[PDB]
Structure 1
């Protein structure tokens, strides 16, 4: 049972700016998604400081990068706090309407797309490299859901019947055909060392074959 939703106008315009602008420094998407994961991991560690049973759904706090060349996908898994259904619908837990207002003022006043993370909407930089993004998520207080969008002004949300997650968020990037470099081992390593050396959680890059 799939529900289809319209993006708010300001979000749809942010995603088409990201899809259509000529901007070569596309590798920042990964920095942005890892930093979102690290923020959700901070949130569940804070909650467990007073209630330890909030880690009954998994005590390990980590980030995994899983390239898959046959599927042409890059997946970013974290065991962070996760999103409820209401977070998913509400622009994936962000204040995206006002953050796009600020961001897209800054672009006309000096800034460039690489500062998108300073406005709370870094998730959407995923569309620099992906034609389609799927977010599987499980929050302790809700069921597991799948959010899905190929841009074009709409997204879908459904109950995910697949592999139980325990707790966390899985961002699946279905990459554009000319962005396959972000599936190679040495290119991902180079981006993680460049932009994410101080993330306070173990980032494991899986290998293939």
Structure 2
């Protein structure tokens, strides 16, 4: 297991997300679905000229999997996935510059729900999760697990878990007071409100 420090700006972003009073926490799901959609667009685009890119799975979709026993909400997509280098580089984001732009926007009146416009929407996971684990498989690499409970560091390891084929799985270990996001009607409400026009099937698993 390798342990890495977050860049200062990202640690700052995470601390802001964790400590700022902000009631509209539900936007985390919109942001994660949007990231999944972006990843799905990318593998679709690459497949247009190289069809073999879909040998690792032709179906392009998103699954939402609540688990009340483990207190986890998992978002799974069959998008392009991430290489180890992507994971280490802030999960394939320009998070340093994005965090800067987001901050400048906040000071200028904007609110936390606008986070996705700055390319750092992933970190909104920390509105509801005490720990986030990301399992990912890119065609050009092995399967990796990234994990962070914030506090300035993340880990990366080769994943010997269930093979994914291709894509990214975000496992949210929910805060004790955020278990509403495990309820079917709540998840349905949020997907209908914020993600009604996503261009891939979203399947909400039941328990």
Following the alignment from structure 2 to structure 1, what is the Cα–Cα distance between the partners of residues 37 and 176?
Answer: 28
Secondary structure of the residue aligned to 2:177 is helix
Following the alignment from structure 1 to structure 2, what is the Cα–Cα distance between the partners of residues 44 and 159?
Answer: 22
TM-score by length of 1: 0.99
Deviations 1:16-64 (A, max 9, x none): 0000000000000000000000000000000000110000000000000
Following the alignment from structure 1 to structure 2, what is the Cα–Cα distance between the partners of residues 115 and 94?
Answer: 16
Deviations 1:170-206 (A, max 9, x none): 0000000000000000000000000000000000000
Following the alignment from structure 1 to structure 2, what is the Cα–Cα distance between the partners of residues 49 and 39?
Answer: 16
Which consecutive aligned stretches of 4+ in structure 1 deviate over 6 angstroms post-superposition? none
- 1:92 Cα deviation from its structure 2 partner: 0.2
- 1:115 Cα deviation from its structure 2 partner: 0.1
Secondary structure of the residue aligned to 1:131 is strand
Secondary structure of the residue aligned to 1:178 is coil
- 1:7 Cα deviation from its structure 2 partner: 0.2
Deviations 1:60-105 (A, max 9, x none): 0000000000000000000000000000000000000000000011
5+ residue gaps in structure 1?
none
Following the alignment from structure 1 to structure 2, what is the Cα–Cα distance between the partners of residues 21 and 144?
Answer: 34
- The equivalent of 2:186 in structure 1 is 187
Deviations 1:140-196 (A, max 9, x none): 000000000000000000000000000000000000000000000000000000000
- The equivalent of 1:110 in structure 2 is 109
Following the alignment from structure 2 to structure 1, what is the Cα–Cα distance between the partners of residues 170 and 34?
Answer: 13
Deviations 1:111-144 (A, max 9, x none): 0000000000000000000000000000000000
- The equivalent of 1:204 in structure 2 is 203
Following the alignment from structure 1 to structure 2, what is the Cα–Cα distance between the partners of residues 124 and 69?
Answer: 23
- The equivalent of 1:86 in structure 2 is 85
Following the alignment from structure 1 to structure 2, what is the Cα–Cα distance between the partners of residues 83 and 108?
Answer: 32
Number of equivalences: 207
- The equivalent of 1:148 in structure 2 is 147
Secondary structure of the residue aligned to 1:177 is coil
Pairing of 1:40-189 with structure 2 (within 5 A): 40-189=39-188
TM-score by length of 2: 1.00
Secondary structure of the residue aligned to 1:10 is helix
5+ residue gaps in structure 2?
none
